[PDB]
Design a protein around this ligand. Structure first.
Ligand SMILES: C=CC1=C(C)[C@@H](Cc2[nH]c(/C=C3N=C(/C=C4\NC(=O)[C@H](C)[C@H]4CC)C(C)=C\3CCC(=O)O)c(CCC(=O)O)c2C)NC1=O
Ligand SMILES: C=CC1=C(C)[C@@H](Cc2[nH]c(/C=C3N=C(/C=C4\NC(=O)[C@H](C)[C@H]4CC)C(C)=C\3CCC(=O)O)c(CCC(=O)O)c2C)NC1=O
Ligand SMILES: C=CC1=C(C)[C@@H](Cc2[nH]c(/C=C3N=C(/C=C4\NC(=O)[C@H](C)[C@H]4CC)C(C)=C\3CCC(=O)O)c(CCC(=O)O)c2C)NC1=O
Ligand SMILES: C=CC1=C(C)[C@@H](Cc2[nH]c(/C=C3N=C(/C=C4\NC(=O)[C@H](C)[C@H]4CC)C(C)=C\3CCC(=O)O)c(CCC(=O)O)c2C)NC1=O
Ligand SMILES: C=CC1=C(C)[C@@H](Cc2[nH]c(/C=C3N=C(/C=C4\NC(=O)[C@H](C)[C@H]4CC)C(C)=C\3CCC(=O)O)c(CCC(=O)O)c2C)NC1=O
Ligand SMILES: C=CC1=C(C)[C@@H](Cc2[nH]c(/C=C3N=C(/C=C4\NC(=O)[C@H](C)[C@H]4CC)C(C)=C\3CCC(=O)O)c(CCC(=O)O)c2C)NC1=O
Ligand SMILES: C=CC1=C(C)[C@@H](Cc2[nH]c(/C=C3N=C(/C=C4\NC(=O)[C@H](C)[C@H]4CC)C(C)=C\3CCC(=O)O)c(CCC(=O)O)c2C)NC1=O
Ligand SMILES: C=CC1=C(C)[C@@H](Cc2[nH]c(/C=C3N=C(/C=C4\NC(=O)[C@H](C)[C@H]4CC)C(C)=C\3CCC(=O)O)c(CCC(=O)O)c2C)NC1=O
Ligand SMILES: C=CC1=C(C)[C@@H](Cc2[nH]c(/C=C3N=C(/C=C4\NC(=O)[C@H](C)[C@H]4CC)C(C)=C\3CCC(=O)O)c(CCC(=O)O)c2C)NC1=O
Ligand SMILES: C=CC1=C(C)[C@@H](Cc2[nH]c(/C=C3N=C(/C=C4\NC(=O)[C@H](C)[C@H]4CC)C(C)=C\3CCC(=O)O)c(CCC(=O)O)c2C)NC1=O
Ligand SMILES: C=CC1=C(C)[C@@H](Cc2[nH]c(/C=C3N=C(/C=C4\NC(=O)[C@H](C)[C@H]4CC)C(C)=C\3CCC(=O)O)c(CCC(=O)O)c2C)NC1=O
Ligand SMILES: C=CC1=C(C)[C@@H](Cc2[nH]c(/C=C3N=C(/C=C4\NC(=O)[C@H](C)[C@H]4CC)C(C)=C\3CCC(=O)O)c(CCC(=O)O)c2C)NC1=O
Ligand SMILES: C=CC1=C(C)[C@@H](Cc2[nH]c(/C=C3N=C(/C=C4\NC(=O)[C@H](C)[C@H]4CC)C(C)=C\3CCC(=O)O)c(CCC(=O)O)c2C)NC1=O
Ligand SMILES: CCC1=C(C)[C@@H](CC2=N/C(=C\c3[nH]c(C[C@@H]4NC(=O)C(C)=C4CC)c(C)c3CCC(=O)O)C(CCC(=O)O)=C2C)NC1=O
Lengths: 164, 177, 238, 145, 164, 177, 164, 177
């Protein structure tokens, strides 16, 4: 995982040095910002079945061509496999809010994604509409706090920038 | 590798659940003792030069058999490597106290080391007496109960941070002996 | 007189210009870094076990004439392949000269200094692909898997480059067999103190040069450091 | 010579006496080595940039019909063409033996020379400050060569 | 430039040998099979303008969602740049018929293609639709000869093996 | 590298003086809007992969000679390399915007890149335009006048940091010119 | 130099990756604890001439043998150079009070210091008495504030840990 | 300079042999068709002015991004400096066609044209198209196969001089790339 903690230990291991006050002050950033990045942690974990349902069809609302045969949305268990993938992703976005960095998204969702989606005929532009619909439907004082809405959206468009 | 914040991720990924109100009491407490934790690493980075010499000469005062000819401190080349690797495992446990987990020990310190030390002629009895004596030197710096050097700090109980490093030293002193 | 393009008879401006002196300072740091990286091999008065040329009297002189033809093929590179050799050796030396801004400063100017350090720093902590013999076929098939992907830019589009080539003359490549077969045995018959210094430095080499905070690539390198020492720069086509 | 004279007495002397202003140009292009005979291009692409304006400079060495003028002639007796050939290679070799203070002086003097006498535009001073040996190969057009 | 002559002399130059009897014999294969692939070369060259209009609209026949606003066929000049690329791919398959191999595809159409279509948000599943419409549109003794349809279409489904 | 903190250190190292209270008010005001530096650079990195597709295709549709046959953006390997260095320059400008000084720019990116584009036949006159479109895009995202995406920031003035990135893309545009 | 910024900008450059939300979070630690070491800086800069009058003779307090003839501190102008020598090291720890790392120490104060003192016969084991005298000479509500003293002492015994 | 009569005489001077009638067979054949070559060079020079307008405007209509801003034929100074070197290439291959040897071409026009076009930023891929249309205009004027203006000539074959002038234009093309 790549987090705030995991970077400075690898930087000190590269130099062959003890954790000095440059590495010590990086975890000070996990004191003021972890009050806001963990404010949006349980809002996703306590409402994970609501965000998957009315953003997973927003994939299919923009791309309704998948219901024709030969495509990926051609039968119901493929759609039942389709809602699992954005439920996998928002679990990983919740996994990167509680870790501080972008580790669990990188180690488990993005690495190797560009090789599977091309051979299995899965459009990554159809992935990115379900991700980006949760970004602009997010209200800043209603869904979460003000600084948590900046924080949760910043991990969200990293995945948009990962797939495109 | 892992850490403390990544441990509750892979504990939640072991069943593919989320991280909600059940697993967050260990992690919402972790930011509260973070200023205890950042003051614990600052205590151990201050004094690493003597506490390896406290350990590798305390190994001498109970075991002079390596300065006996044919030992492992007879050579000045070998006595540097006992001082160089006396602090690397001290550098790795200070990595583990900053990480909140001993994940960096079982790949960068522990794994390979027993197969290393058979191919060097390393006395395995010297391994356990070196780490356990500097274990008491480590918690004396953490609980500020070092009887020839004191330090200024903020008041409060700190034995939870003294027990966390006490769970690290018996890991590495076990398999290589 | 006017220029050589019209009505002259001998080539002019034979003078040490700025680019020749820039090549002249960079060749001299190449003879200082390769001096200093050989100091760890020959640290006492005797030559070590791995500073050897060959075994056959005709094979020790064939190591130089191969390597004198090897350094011509780096000079014979294309303009795109020289520029990709230029910046990738810049990147792999900042990872090498890690904690110093002054040591980072010198390599950004001098370009043959970058080739000199990251070839010698691979051979100072012996993270080369020749010096490691894996202990079993478990570690060998991990080591044989990674270098075939490193051989996959010897043929970039299925046609071979010049950098992977080892035969330059008639009957040349058979000496290149037995020089590495003897190098494989001397790495296997090396000292027991050196070979466990090799595996720990090579697993520390791959975690900073190619893993970059990845938990999976660090885990295979800590399980198989023989595959970590087979990992090299991609400027080398071989 | 009107645009290198400093005070108005000097530009009055250059007007009344036209033979003085010819050797005034021959004063300034010897105290600052901005001639072609001291021009050393540092590279091959600046050597070709020098030859782009020598072929314009040889075009005024002939007339507009195509006959060779008398301004460009390298021999007057038997073997003087070879004697001028074997001498000019020596002064070309002496142009490569200057000091480092002398090379950096005329490099900033040639680009100074080309951009106040031969730059009405931005690109003519664009070539001069980037390639100073191209600025050294610009004659006054009173000379044929 | 993977060709018949190029890969046999680079293997000889790898070991530093002369072109031996194994190497002259591969060029002997470029007389018998070179009659068939070169006979399909001016068949594609003489009729290329009727291919890319009548097999280029099969991209938006199946994938009709691209013309919608937002996606890659949203106006005229992005539609016009789509017919240019299948005409670019029709040249590089015509260029592969005359080199005797997979040369001009592997340098000018395949290498680096899987990173351009990601960052330009171009679906490669739409690219293989207009190519596979040309792959099955083959009346075998009427376009070309009986064996010329084998070697022509061998580069077509290699491209679908590359883009997917 | 260096940053804006170490820039006044190496300027005071040349005079070997202690940095007193007089010259640190440039850096006392710098840490007052340290949230503003993070609130500006987050707008760039969130739209980083969409800014280089906005700029390279803006370079093609203004100068169509690169997609001519033979040209610099004709081979599909070459367009992959042009989008490769679109996000390298956008990485290194956002490195310098985060650090506050451009000292990471002319040693790891701009060092030797002028003669590299000359030796590769890269047309540098259209390569200024691919940088200058990223200059007009980074100044739009920071002051939040980008006319297809607005973000949520606290109200205030950020013209001092709008010109911080506008002096950095023009440092790229002046070095490869 | 090693700073809070210059570690994570060099760590993200190792993979060629953008500044992630992990990397902005480490900069947030360099704001709140930056003001702790900042008021230690100009208080040291306003009082630097009086520390070296007490740290100068402290090396001659417990080692009075330096002024013996035959050693490298025998005359008066070497003691004036010895007072100059510690003022460089107190200038260097004033610099890491600004940059928050060990940047101006590990290339300007330690790098090469193990060999210039072994070749010019200046005892490093006696030299560290000058710095460590200033460590316990620290009145944490009277010198400066409280949280400046937990890091200014940490820079000084880092310099004890670097020479020995 | 080495012409066709003087190309062979430095080949004999590499071995110091008297040139004899075994070597004049290439030369007496060359002097026999010299009226055809003077009928060949005159067909180029008498159409030489529009032939560079036939080619450079052929370069613009194939690739319209040269007159685009950022193109290297954009401004009116640059199109004048391209039509100036449109006719220098046609002047220097009429110098090689009249002399029967391309050793007036490889040293008085292209000894250093590669690095000149590199260091100026002149695109190499479009200067091939500037000279290859003049290759196809030479062989239409040598063979009298111009579809808009045919010149009156004596009858007979002229296919060797069309192959010779096309073997001069590729040496322009293979050096500036
Ligand atoms: C034998 C053991 C073995 C390994 C340890 C890896 C190591 C490895 N990775 C890559 C290749 C790669 N490695 C990565 C790295 C990662 N990808 C991710 O999803 C993570 C974020 C990160 C791991 C931490 C990426 C992104 C590439 C593709 C781009 C590249 O060539 O670097 C390559 C080049 C050839 C290839 O693509 O396979 C190699 C040898 N591969 C192996 O065969
Ligand atoms: C973790 C993130 C997080 C959230 C996304 C919300 C959870 C949430 N609230 C709504 C539901 C809603 N959200 C809004 C809010 C708005 N609608 C607008 O048109 C305005 C732009 C905006 C106010 C700022 C409204 C008005 C509803 C009810 C209508 C609806 O969307 O069904 C929806 C979609 C419909 C539903 O299932 O109910 C979701 C997932 N709470 C959270 O903790
Ligand atoms: C045989 C020879 C021999 C020695 C060399 C010493 C070494 C030594 N020191 C300690 C014990 C210790 N050693 C240290 C280290 C240090 N103490 C300080 O005050 C400094 C900061 C630092 C020296 C640089 C510390 C902190 C303790 C814990 C007790 C304390 O000092 O307060 C112990 C463990 C005692 C025990 O548990 O039995 C030993 C063996 N003692 C010996 O018998
Ligand atoms: C031609 C240019 C040139 C360079 C750039 C340097 C780079 C360099 N330094 C060292 C060798 C060294 N380099 C350093 C320097 C440093 N180590 C640190 O921990 C600090 C962060 C940093 C100071 C900035 C030290 C202390 C050694 C000796 C021990 C070691 O290798 O770490 C070596 C190997 C030789 C040896 O083992 O001694 C090389 C190649 N040397 C050169 O000849
Ligand atoms: C620092 C001290 C130092 C040395 C002791 C020598 C090490 C050295 N290198 C080579 C000779 C070589 N060494 C390499 C280098 C490598 N080959 C690879 O596969 C890796 C990518 C890379 C580091 C291992 C290459 C490519 C050759 C020439 C071919 C060869 O013989 O392997 C030889 C000749 C014997 C032989 O290998 O056959 C020796 C003694 N060079 C040094 O710089
Ligand atoms: C892999 C190995 C391999 C070869 C060695 C050649 C073998 C070869 N040469 C020729 C055939 C020929 N080769 C030549 C050439 C020459 N004749 C001479 O006396 C000159 C020395 C030389 C002139 C350059 C000629 C003139 C013919 C007959 C005409 C022709 O076939 O075109 C033929 C066709 C006739 C036949 O089938 O026998 C073949 C197969 N091809 C191969 O595939
Ligand atoms: C010779 C090799 C060669 C190629 C393989 C292509 C590849 C290619 N396509 C595009 C660029 C493009 N390509 C398309 C094409 C399509 N989009 C779709 O929805 C369909 C899948 C397809 C039409 C059938 C579109 C719409 C763009 C514009 C994208 C943009 O400008 O952002 C670009 C960027 C420059 C440009 O606009 O041309 C390149 C290099 N071009 C080449 O020169
Ligand atoms: C140079 C490349 C080239 C080919 C690969 C073919 C393929 C081909 N056939 C048709 C067009 C056609 N092709 C056929 C042929 C057939 N229909 C069948 O069901 C049979 C399998 C097969 C008999 C051989 C028929 C009947 C039409 C006319 C129907 C139509 O409009 O598509 C078209 C559309 C434009 C055109 O008429 O040419 C193309 C590209 N023709 C070419 O010029
Ligand atoms: C660390 C610093 C660093 C950089 C700044 C980049 C930049 C960079 N690009 C290229 C290489 C290239 N760069 C371009 C880029 C362009 N051509 C255009 O028409 C556009 C103006 C522009 C894209 C916007 C192209 C087309 C190539 C390939 C040239 C070729 O294939 O011959 C190279 C040579 C190595 C290679 O071929 O990959 C480098 C170093 N990469 C780096 O490592
Ligand atoms: C000829 C063809 C042509 C284009 C392709 C576009 C490309 C383009 N966009 C902008 C201008 C811009 N470009 C972007 C970039 C984007 N917008 C977004 O919201 C996304 C994040 C990203 C696309 C994925 C932004 C944010 C602006 C600022 C205005 C705005 O959109 O709010 C500019 C700068 C204009 C100037 O310099 O004044 C250009 C050239 N414009 C053209 O004329
Ligand atoms: C780890 C990631 C990380 C961040 C992204 C920032 C997030 C951030 N930004 C600001 C705060 C701010 N950000 C801006 C910036 C702007 N306002 C505008 O109107 C312009 C569009 C834009 C200029 C670039 C302003 C004006 C403030 C208020 C000043 C302040 O309190 O700092 C604040 C303080 C107030 C708050 O709690 O929200 C924080 C925490 N900090 C972090 O630690
Ligand atoms: C004796 C040898 C000799 C030559 C071979 C030519 C060619 C030539 N052209 C230019 C100079 C130039 N040459 C061109 C020509 C072109 N740029 C293009 O994009 C097209 C491919 C091509 C026209 C067809 C342009 C546009 C300039 C001016 C560049 C500028 O002003 O920045 C120069 C530099 C000196 C100058 O300013 O003129 C030379 C040597 N002229 C000579 O004197
Ligand atoms: C977009 C703009 C554009 C052009 C400028 C031309 C450029 C051009 N001219 C020719 C081809 C030619 N160009 C000429 C040149 C000339 N013809 C004459 O009669 C005059 C004597 C002289 C101009 C003064 C000649 C002689 C030929 C050979 C065919 C012919 O005209 O007889 C060719 C190759 C064959 C062809 O396609 O025609 C091209 C591409 N074509 C274009 O598409
Ligand atoms: C362990 C040390 C070692 C070797 C390896 C071989 C090296 C070697 N390669 C050969 C021959 C050879 N050499 C290469 C190049 C090389 N091989 C590859 O599989 C790839 C990807 C390569 C570039 C890096 C190829 C591809 C061939 C096969 C071509 C051929 O045999 O003609 C030959 C035969 C030459 C001859 O007989 O004339 C030898 C001896 N010998 C050694 O002592």
């Amino acid at each position: 995982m790549k987090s705030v903690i995991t970077t400075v230990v690898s930087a000190a291991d590269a130099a062959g040095r003890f954790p000095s006050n440059s590495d010590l002050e990086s975890i000070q950033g996990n004191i003021q910002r972890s009050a806001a990045r963990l404010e949006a942690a349980e809002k996703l974990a306590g409402n994970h079945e609501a965000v998957v349902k009315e953003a997973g069809d927003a994939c299919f609302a923009k791309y309704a061509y998948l219901k024709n045969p030969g495509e990926a949305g051609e039968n119901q268990e493929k759609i039942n496999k389709c809602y699992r993938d954005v439920d996998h992703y928002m679990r990983l976005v919740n996994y990167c809010l509680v870790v501080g960095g972008t580790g669990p998204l990188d180690e488990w969702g993005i690495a190797g994604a560009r090789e599977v989606y091309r051979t299995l005929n899965l459009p990554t532009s159809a992935y990115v509409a379900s991700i980006a619909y949760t970004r602009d439907r997010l209200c800043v004082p209603r869904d979460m706090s003000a600084q948590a809405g900046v924080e949760f959206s910043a991990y969200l468009d990293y995945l948009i920038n990962a797939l495109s | 590798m892992l850490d403390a914040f990544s441990r509750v991720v892979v504990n939640s990924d072991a069943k593919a659940a989320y991280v909600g109100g059940s697993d967050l009491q260990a992690l919402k407490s972790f930011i509260a003792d973070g200023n205890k934790r950042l003051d614990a690493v600052n205590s151990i980075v201050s004094n690493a030069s003597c506490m390896v010499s406290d350990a590798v000469s305390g190994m001498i005062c109970e075991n002079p058999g390596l300065i006996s000819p044919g030992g492992n401190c007879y050579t000045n080349r070998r006595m540097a490597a006992c001082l160089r690797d006396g602090e690397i495992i001290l550098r790795y446990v200070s990595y583990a106290l900053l990480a909140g987990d001993a994940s960096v020990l079982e790949d960068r310190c522990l794994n390979g080391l027993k197969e290393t030390y058979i191919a060097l002629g390393v006395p395995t009895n010297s391994s356990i007496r070196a780490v356990s004596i500097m274990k008491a030197q480590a918690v004396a710096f953490i609980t500020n109960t070092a009887t020839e050097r004191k330090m200024s700090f903020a008041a409060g109980d700190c034995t939870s941070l003294a027990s966390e490093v006490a769970s690290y030293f018996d890991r590495v002193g076990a398999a290589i002996s | 007189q006017t220029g050589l393009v019209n009505s002259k008879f001998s080539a002019r401006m034979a003078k040490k210009t700025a680019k020749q002196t820039k090549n002249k300072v960079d060749e001299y740091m190449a003879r200082s870094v390769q001096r200093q990286y050989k100091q760890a091999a020959v640290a006492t008065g005797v030559y070590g076990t791995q500073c050897t040329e060959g075994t056959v009297k005709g094979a020790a002189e064939a190591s130089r004439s191969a390597a004198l033809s090897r350094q011509f093929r780096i000079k014979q590179r294309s303009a795109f392949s020289k520029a990709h050799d230029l910046f990738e050796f810049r990147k792999h030396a900042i990872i090498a000269a890690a904690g110093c801004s002054y040591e980072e400063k010198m390599v950004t100017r001098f370009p043959k200094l970058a080739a000199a350090m990251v070839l010698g720093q691979t051979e100072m902590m012996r993270t080369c692909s020749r010096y490691v013999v894996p202990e079993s076929v478990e570690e060998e098939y991990m080591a044989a898997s990674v270098d075939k992907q490193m051989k996959r830019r010897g043929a970039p589009g299925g046609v071979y480059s010049l950098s992977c080539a080892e035969g330059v003359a008639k009957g040349q490549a058979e000496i290149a067999r037995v020089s590495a077969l003897g190098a494989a045995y001397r790495a296997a018959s090396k000292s027991a103190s050196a070979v466990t210094a090799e595996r720990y430095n090579s697993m520390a080499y791959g975690r900073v040069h190619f893993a970059h905070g990845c938990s999976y690539e660090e885990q295979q390198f800590n399980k198989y450091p023989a595959a970590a020492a087979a990992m090299r720069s991609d400027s080398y086509g071989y | 010579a009107l645009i290198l004279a400093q005070n108005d007495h000097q530009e009055k002397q250059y007007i009344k006496y036209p033979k003085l202003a010819a050797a005034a140009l021959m004063a300034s292009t010897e105290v600052t080595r901005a001639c072609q005979r001291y021009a050393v291009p540092e590279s091959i692409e600046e050597e070709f940039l020098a030859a782009s304006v020598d072929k314009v400079n040889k075009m005024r060495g002939t007339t507009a019909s195509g006959v060779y003028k008398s301004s460009c002639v390298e021999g007057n007796a038997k073997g003087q063409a070879e004697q001028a050939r074997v001498a000019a290679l020596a002064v070309a070799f002496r142009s490569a033996q200057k000091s480092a203070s002398q090379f950096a002086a005329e490099r900033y003097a040639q680009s100074k020379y080309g951009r106040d006498l031969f730059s009405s535009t931005h690109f003519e001073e664009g070539y001069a400050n980037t390639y100073p040996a191209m600025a050294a190969a610009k004659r006054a057009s009173s000379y044929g060569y």
